[PDB]
Amino acid sequence: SNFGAISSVLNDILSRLDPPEAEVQIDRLITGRLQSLQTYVTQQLIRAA
Amino acid sequence: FKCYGVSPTKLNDLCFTNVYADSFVIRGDEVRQIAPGQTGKIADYNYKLPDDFTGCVIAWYLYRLFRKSNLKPFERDISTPLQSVVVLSFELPATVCGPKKSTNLVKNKCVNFNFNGLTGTGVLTESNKKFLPFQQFGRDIADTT
Predict the structure, then answer these.
(1) What chain B residue is nearest to A12 in terms of C-alpha separation?
(2) Residues 7-36 of A with CB under 8 A from B
(3) Which of A29, B78, B85, B97 is the most exposed place for a label (fewest CB within 10 A)?
(4) Which residue stretches belong to region Integrin-binding motif (chain B)?
């Protein structure tokens, strides 16, 4: 999932953009993947209960 | 000179699969309207860039006055009303790719590889996966190369 960025592959962003414009895309990818990890860990806790 | 989707430094390291080029006369003060997401008489009735543009605008005599609607991205109109600068566009088979000197293959090591503009790190072997005459790469169950 791109989460509103230009790509879902990080190396393509790092090869197509300069770093101060790659910042705002990598931030969106980090935010989406943190949301996915937190959802997974919460449901694993409730399922282990 | 303003490259929107890519960087001007990074233009020499990629493969683009096609390159278009556009040419028209603007007055020199209406070069603002050749950006993504703009209005004006040029960006509504004459030449409309999409809201997701990958390319560079390079700028260093009739124009239309009226039209009943706004255009689509990359639309022409040669109908008859009308009364009196390079736009490169990319799309991401290489075929228009860039100037890098290659270096021959190395098997069985973790290496940094660059196959037609895709980077990575891993160990290259010889594959049993028989292809067809229409492939550039393959994928897996979890959608990775």
Answers:
(1) B118
(2) 11-12, 15-18, 21
(3) B78
(4) 27-29
